[PDB]
Amino acid sequence: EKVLCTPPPKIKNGKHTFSEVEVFEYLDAVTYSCDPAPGPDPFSLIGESTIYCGDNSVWSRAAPECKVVKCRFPVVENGKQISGFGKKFYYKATVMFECDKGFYLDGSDTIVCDSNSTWDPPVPKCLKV
Amino acid sequence: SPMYSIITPNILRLESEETMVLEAHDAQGDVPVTVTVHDFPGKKLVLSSEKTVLTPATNHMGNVTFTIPANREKGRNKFVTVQATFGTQVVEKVVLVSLQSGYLFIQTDKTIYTPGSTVLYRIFTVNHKLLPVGRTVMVNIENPEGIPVKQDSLSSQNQLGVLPLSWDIPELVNMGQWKIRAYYENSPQQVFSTEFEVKEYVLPSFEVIVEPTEKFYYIYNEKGLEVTITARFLYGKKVEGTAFVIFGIQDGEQRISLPESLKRIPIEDGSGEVVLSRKVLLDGVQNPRAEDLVGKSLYVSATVILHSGSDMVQAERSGIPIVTSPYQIHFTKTPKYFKPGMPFDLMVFVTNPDGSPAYRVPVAVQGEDTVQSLTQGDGVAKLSINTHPSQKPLSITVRTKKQELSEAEQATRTMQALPYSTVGNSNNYLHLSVLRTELRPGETLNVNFLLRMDRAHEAKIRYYTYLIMNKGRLLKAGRQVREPGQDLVVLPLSITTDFIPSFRLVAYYTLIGASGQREVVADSVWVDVKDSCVGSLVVKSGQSEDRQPVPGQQMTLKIEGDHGARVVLVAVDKGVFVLNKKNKLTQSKIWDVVEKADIGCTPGSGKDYAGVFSDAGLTFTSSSGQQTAQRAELQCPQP
Amino acid sequence: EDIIAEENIVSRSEFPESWLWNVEDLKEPPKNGISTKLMNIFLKDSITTWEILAVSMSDKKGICVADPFEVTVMQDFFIDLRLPYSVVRNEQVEIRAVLYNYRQNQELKVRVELLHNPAFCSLATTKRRHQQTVTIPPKSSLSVPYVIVPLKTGLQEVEVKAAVYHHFISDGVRKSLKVVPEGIRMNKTVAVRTLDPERLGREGVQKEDIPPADLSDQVPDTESETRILLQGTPVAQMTEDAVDAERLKHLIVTPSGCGEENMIGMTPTVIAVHYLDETEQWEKFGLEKRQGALELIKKGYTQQLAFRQPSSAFAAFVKRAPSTWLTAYVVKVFSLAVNLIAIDSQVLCGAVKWLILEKQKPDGVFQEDAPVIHQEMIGGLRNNNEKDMALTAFVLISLQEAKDICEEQVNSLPGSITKAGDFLEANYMNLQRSYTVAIAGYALAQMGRLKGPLLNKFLTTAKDKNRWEDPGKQLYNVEATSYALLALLQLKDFDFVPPVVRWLNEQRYYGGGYGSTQATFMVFQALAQYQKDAPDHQELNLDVSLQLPSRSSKITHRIHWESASLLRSEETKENEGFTVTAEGKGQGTLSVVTMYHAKAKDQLTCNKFDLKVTIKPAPKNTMILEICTRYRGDQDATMSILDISMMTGFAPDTDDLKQLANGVDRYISKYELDKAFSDRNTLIIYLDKVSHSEDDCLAFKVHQYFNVELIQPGAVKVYAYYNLEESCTRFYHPEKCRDELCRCAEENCFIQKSDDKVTLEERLDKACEPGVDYVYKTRLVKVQLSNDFDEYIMAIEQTIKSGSDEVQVGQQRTFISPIKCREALKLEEKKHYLMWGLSSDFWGEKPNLSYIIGKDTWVEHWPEEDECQDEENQKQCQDLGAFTESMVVFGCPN
Ligand SMILES: *[C@@H]1O[C@H](CO)[C@@H](O[C@@H]2O[C@H](CO)[C@@H](O[C@@H]3O[C@H](CO)[C@@H](O)[C@H](O)[C@@H]3O)[C@H](O)[C@H]2NC(C)=O)[C@H](O)[C@H]1NC(C)=O
Ligand SMILES: *[C@@H]1O[C@H](CO)[C@@H](O[C@@H]2O[C@H](CO)[C@@H](O)[C@H](O)[C@H]2NC(C)=O)[C@H](O)[C@H]1NC(C)=O
């Protein structure tokens, strides 16, 4: 008569709140986070961090992922960064560009770092006008 | 020569719809606009990005709406940079951020519980517009020492704003005031609370009401304090019995019982009368000077026992002010700035000593007895006065004029208003005139725009821009056209349910020199809107009379509300409230919470144009350099 | 019979304080947006007014709290049965059922009855049914007293019914009553232990053992609860204050000059903005000032490009040979500025590539071929004997800073870094200057190559463990200590950090001035990094398990800094010792507290009032009732209340009352003097005061108006108006225990048998029932008294049948019994007894096992040998002898 959930799934290099709980009620929620990493680059958390026990005795969402994501330094010839200044680019890092005078944009002015450490959309070019 | 401007709230909240008003004054053709919100000072995140176009069809006025996502404390203020690019020209402004994401309201089924019983409670999860939202919430139960004994994380997603919960109270437990404390997990620093009492009790069979003939005691009243005791069974019948009544004095947190005021009196047909004599009151204290009691309060304790000796009920009436006047005057609704030469509107708020609004009380400006008026249902009276075109401050003194009273018992109060400072002493002003009656949704408020400038430039002003702040956000923005010579224009403002419980109307115009420089001129007014629900909810009898009903009998309940709404219910024995009537949920308490969180700080006007914007809760920024000063303070400034 | 029967009356029993906890939706299409829901519900049995509160939540209208709707549920005839929150077992109390007649023009003749219940001694039994008939005037009420004695603890039940003659009118009320044991609710603190596995345990494991509670004074046959509380002890770590924003204003400067001086000016502004961003000080510094500072940084950068040579290296003048140090310093500054402004990668990575290809020697050393003109801008590198080590470290540090920016553009970078590392590694131990130990220490720590003896050299080179210093310019020591602090942060050696940061801040060096370039850049880089990396608190991850002997599986909890204040609780009904194990990081608290019912030494009733009630025949039946009360205080009692109930069929003299009502210190209601209708059975006398120096006494007469077999005792209750709980009750009835109510309450004292109806076969039959665990011949050594219990100390003279308790002949056992049972048992010291009972009678544990004399305990007086010689004792004495011989020789059958 009352919807219950078996504990949320465990994840590689991560953990979740209420890990000492075996029986979960209705609407009971849990938040994931990543472990500290051995290397110089920390783990990024991919997906929703918080899931709850809703209808059908299932968890609202699939458990997130904890892995190292690191895009390469984005370089735009005859252009400049106007946002996202930094040396390191992890998951969801966003960079905006703006072409120098006498130059126009060929591609998105805004790029984001993928879960496969690739810029999405690709790094734009600044073209001679 | 085109001037581009942006307007946003003074304080931006997380996960709440925010609007940014965009204007291109004196612009030709289409003006593309890109609006971006970044984190300050690193600009690591694109918090928002929206596009729009300013067209002659929209009179080069538009907006964008944006939302700031959940952040990432030490309590240090956070900031964002809001940025707008009109064609090539960038206008930017750093803005303060509030970490609040909405409200949580908590309802318990009862106010008091015995050990062994179960607390049934509900958490309502709404945003800043009081609309239901689905989010993750953390809930703590706390004992009377402030230690958490139970802790849960719950999602309210797909629950239409209602989180049903329970907690079992152990048989062995500490008595006293327990607490329920909840917070949105994205905004952990705003905790919402309610209390419930745990005690070993049995339900009373009747209720006792202790009420003084006046809601205060006048220190020169030789009749003393007269009190009426009323006893009545929970089922409606009057009580026969005996009452024990004793009085006391409150001085700060110090209570001083008056043993000599203890009287035993008959309760006949559910009524009794008892008096605290003036002599007893004065002999009960060491201070010879009677006037020293002024500022303190009296309390009354009444214990009624049935003739059968089967039940006993205690009730207390406290906070009865010892006063010299039945009234107090407040200027908390009046602007503290005026425009020299133009009418100044005084909102005088008169209250009874307990703090409730006084009704139909004559008030008058001292020195201009001609200028008088009568306070209304909300305790407000409006007094319009004519000002000289000098920089000399307005000192205003108001007195009450209740003819039933003596002069010594009239209330009095003084305030000061400073002149609004024009740009480069140009003597250019804007004045908003408005009606102040009980204002309700569905009606239309006529806003009067009265211009005051030099005839050499008056034709340049072809419109006013107006903005409506409500519940801490920009509700609506618009334009009011003006033809040359129209020194007064009217705006028919439609008051919808979105204006509850109040709003601010800021208006401004701008023009060029007149010595080549851009001048911005502003004014504002604050308007009260009659408290209710946005919709409606009523519970009554689906009968057909058949009252009074009988134990065990079926009855029909008529529930009239708004379509699609989810209604939650509870039935409580009145004896419970005879025991404890605190921490209950009402609509007025909700509106109170909302009004506390208001980001506007004054009743209106301002020191100058920037003051007018900021005091109303707004930023203003132009491409020509005119802008509001930085606000760094979540709270409104203090006296 | 002109009445409704007791079997045909359904008593009201539904009295929730709250109900109707329901969620409902408005789906009915509306009139002007207003939907109207009709719902059917069933009013509970309570006679009161309900407050129905509704709350709605709309997707577009939001939240709305409705006004309360009241529904009054009422009857014209009903019983009001009000019971205390709790009553004590074996204590005689008076409850009252008040009958209400709210009919305007109709008198009621009512028969009222209290149902029998084995949990209470009352005038109604299994076969005898206590019924009364009383007459209730219209628009009036009437109270019906019932004297009862609760027998067993827990949630029991009281039900009274009533009906009027000649009309179809009835009502019943069935309410539960809470019965509690004798004594006082006590708790004992058993254990309070500090949890800290790091410090208190072996190899990080802390086992804690907890003893049982004593409970020697526990009330027989009562429950106890052991409560086990766990909580965390959160500890904050202090972080040194940031350097105040105001101190950095002077560092916002305009960059000018050629290749070297432009960088001298660029340095303070870059690091100031960097420090202000990290410590979040812009609000206080002035938020709108940052943009101007960025522009100055941009200008510094742009101006520096004019001194970039075709090779990508830098020098003071374009015609001057490029400097290894200056080019490396530009990389250092630009790499940090990448977080602030758009830096051209190719400029930065070009400089890196040039350093590696042109200036790194085959042994890994970086070499300067053209020293800068401003020798004061290089800090402690100047005049440093250890030239190759210091410059290589300096350049290596710049390369590390650029590593992520230049990763894809300079393939020779990682091998260059490794090569430079090898040189520093192989020569580190031979270092003599603290400056070089510090800077090369940092360079190696960035690579994870500062270990063993090199790490030990780095740490022990510090003086007083707080600074790296050499003789010479003090600015060099500040710079060096800043490098060392950065190394410490790199190693995560946080326990060594606090003295170092304190020494730095104590120098009050705020940058700027001649030759201040390296000190200014390094001090604020180091202090910024410190604010970013220093932990705010000790880690708190405690794993705590407890094993109760009563259970099989570990109960495990984790304690966290996040929920450190959270009180984990575990409870057990057993009074058992147990173990607690703690593992992990941080500190916490374990507390063990057992709650129980303790036997009282002194009286728990009448603690504020003294009340003596007397009733004596007067010299048409008539007796005089005298009431004496004294307040137990330092002062006289204030206005107090005497609530008096008459014995059955009695009523007070009138002219006696009127004389009391005319009394100046007392008051009687005119109401209770305008009556004469058996409503005169209850009476309240109001007292202005109750003396505390002496007894206050009053007396009046009472007239019997009604004869009956079952005369219930009257009662007098005294209390002050402000405290109903501080009362005292005394019962009264005529004499010349006995009878009827005492008797019914004495029944469970022990097995009741009329002497000389007990046979030999009967004893053998009952003593041999399985369940009968012990059979003793005892001698009463001594009687011992408590407030609610007699304790009989028995010498065990013969173990006729032995059970769980291995008592030996000559040993003593204590038998406990309620004080009400004293006269029934009539035990006397020095006399002998035959006693047998169940295993349920055992109490406590060895060697403190005790016996409860209960309803199934046999207790028979065993005549002394001299009495047995009389013919009239022969049967009992001989039967006891034959009983004993049979039980010992052959035992119970089978
Ligand atoms: C374990 O036993 C001890 C002893 O009874 C309990 O300590 C006592 O707790 C009572 C109940 O809260 C306290 O009585 C109260 O005192 C305060 C003033 O301190 C007063 O405002 C109340 O009206 C009431 O009289 C009492 O202070 C306290 N005494 C001591 C010595 O600590 C303890 O509470 C018991 N533990 C549990 C879990 O119940
Ligand atoms: C922001 O601009 C939009 C579009 O102008 C406004 O949204 C509409 O406003 C019109 C009236 O001009 C209404 O008829 C529509 O119902 C609104 N639609 C939506 C999507 O809400 C919006 O009111 C503006 N916000 C302001 C002025 O603060």
Gyration radius of chain A, in Å: 20 Å
Total count of strands of chain A: 11
The secondary structure category of chain C is: alpha+beta
The chain pair forming the largest interface, with residue counts per chain, is: B-C, 100 and 101 residues
Largest sheet report of chain C: 7 strands, mixed
Distance between the termini of chain C: 59 Å
Q: Give, in order, the helices and strands of chain A.
A: EEEEEEEEEEE
Reported CATH architecture of the largest domain in chain A: Ribbon
How many structural domains are formed by the residues of chain C?
6
The count of helical stretches of chain C stands at 19
CATH class of the largest domain in chain A: Mainly Beta
Residues in β-strands, percent of chain C: 25-35%
Fraction of helical residues of chain A:
under 10%
What name does CATH use for the topology of the largest domain in chain C?
Glycosyltransferase
The radius of gyration over CA of chain C amounts to 47 Å
Determine the number of helices of chain A (DSSP H or I, runs of at least 4 residues): 0
> Using DSSP, what is the number of strands of chain C?
39
Largest sheet: spatial strand order of chain C: 37-38-35-34-33-36-39
By CATH, the architecture of the largest domain in chain C is named Alpha/alpha barrel
Task: Please outline what is shown here.
The complex is a heterotrimer of chains A (129), B (639) and C (894). With 129 residues, chain A is mostly beta strands.
Output the keywords.
heterotrimer, A: 129 residues, Complement Module, domain 1, 2 domains, 11 strands, 0% helix, C: 894 residues, alpha+beta, S-adenosyl-L-methionine-dependent methyltransferases, Immunoglobulin-like, Jelly Rolls, 7-stranded mixed sheet, 19 helices, 24% helix, elongated, binds a molecule of 3 linked components (NAG-NAG-BMA), binds a molecule of 2 linked components (NAG-NAG), Complement C3b (chain C), Membrane cofactor protein (chain A), lipid binding
Structure description:
Chain C: Residues 202-221 are annotated as: Disordered. Chain C: The modification Phosphoserine is found at residues 216, 569, 804. The complex is a heterotrimer of chains A (129), B (639) and C (894). Chain A is mostly beta strands. Chain A has strands at 14-16, 29-34, 44-46, 50-52, 65-67, 79-83, 94-99, 103-106, 110-113, 119-120, 125-128. Chain A folds into two domains: 1-68, Complement Module, domain 1 (Ribbon), CATH 2.10.70; 69-129, Complement Module, domain 1. A four-stranded antiparallel beta sheet of chain A has the order 6-7-9-10, with no helix packed on it. In chain A, strands 1-2-4 form a three-stranded antiparallel beta sheet, with no helix packed on it. Chain A is elongated, with a radius of gyration of 20 Å. The termini of chain A are far apart. Chain C has six domains: 14-75, S-adenosyl-L-methionine-dependent methyltransferases, CATH 2.20.130; 76-181, Immunoglobulins (Immunoglobulin-like); 182-237 and 536-600, Jelly Rolls (Sandwich), CATH 2.60.120; 238-535, Glycosyltransferase; 606-736, Sandwich (Immunoglobulin-like), CATH 2.60.40.690; 737-894, OB fold (Dihydrolipoamide Acetyltransferase, E2P), CATH 2.40.50.120. Chain C is built from 19 helices and 39 strands. Chain C starts with 17 loop residues before the first strand and ends in a 5-residue tail after the last helix. Chains in contact: A-B, A-C, B-C. Chains B and C meet through strand 11, strand 13, strand 21, strand 40 and strand 41 of B and strand 1, strand 2, strand 3, strand 4 and strand 5 of C. Strand 42 (566-573) of chain B pairs antiparallel with strand 4 (49-58) of chain C. The structure holds a molecule of 3 linked components (NAG-NAG-BMA) and a molecule of 2 linked components (NAG-NAG). A molecule of 2 linked components (NAG-NAG) is lined by residues 19, 63, 474, 476-477 of chain B.
